């Protein structure tokens, strides 16, 4: 029908989801990562993000 998904999710948290688990709440949109923070820690050393200091 036309009422199932008529709500306009294009300007908020409901319009964005993780590419790994599609989790809400905290995400990392910086540099267009679109990944939530807690699994970002697990896969941090896969994208080239290291920790020296």
């Amino acid at each position: 029908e036309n009422v199932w998904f008529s709500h306009p999710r294009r300007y908020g948290k409901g319009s964005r989801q993780c590419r790994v688990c599609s989790s809400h709440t905290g995400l990392i949109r910086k540099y267009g990562l679109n990944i939530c923070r807690q699994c970002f820690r697990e896969k941090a050393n896969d994208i080239g993000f290291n920790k020296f200091r």
């Binding site: 990392i28 910086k30 540099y31 990562l33 923070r37 807690q38 970002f40 820690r41 941090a44 994208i47 080239g48 993000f49 290291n50 920790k51 020296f52 200091r53």
Partner: protein
């Protein structure tokens, strides 16, 4: 024709020898050129809490990554874009040929 070799990577050693090989191919034959220009490194930094939950003392992190950018400026006719175009590419670093 103003061929410029742009190189970006995260590994300094692999990007260095690619420039060295490109500059060593340049100083052979004649190929009057401009040497490696050392652009400032772009250091990404995403600061995140270590705790996956909300419990725990405030302990933040910083996952950083350095991008080294160097461009090589060439100046010669077609008789070297049959020759320079033979990419000396190692894993990591990339090349973008730009003319004029």
């Amino acid at each position: 024709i103003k061929i410029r070799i742009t190189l970006t990577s995260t590994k300094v050693k692999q990007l260095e020898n690619v420039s060295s090989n490109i500059v060593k191919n340049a100083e052979q034959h004649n190929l009057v050129k401009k040497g490696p220009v050392r652009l400032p490194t772009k250091v990404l930094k995403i600061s995140t809490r270590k705790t996956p939950n909300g419990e725990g003392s405030k302990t933040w992190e910083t996952y950083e990554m350095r991008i080294h950018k160097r461009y090589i400026d060439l100046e010669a006719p077609v008789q070297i874009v049959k020759r320079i175009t033979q990419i000396t590419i190692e894993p990591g670093v990339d090349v973008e040929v730009v003319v004029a």
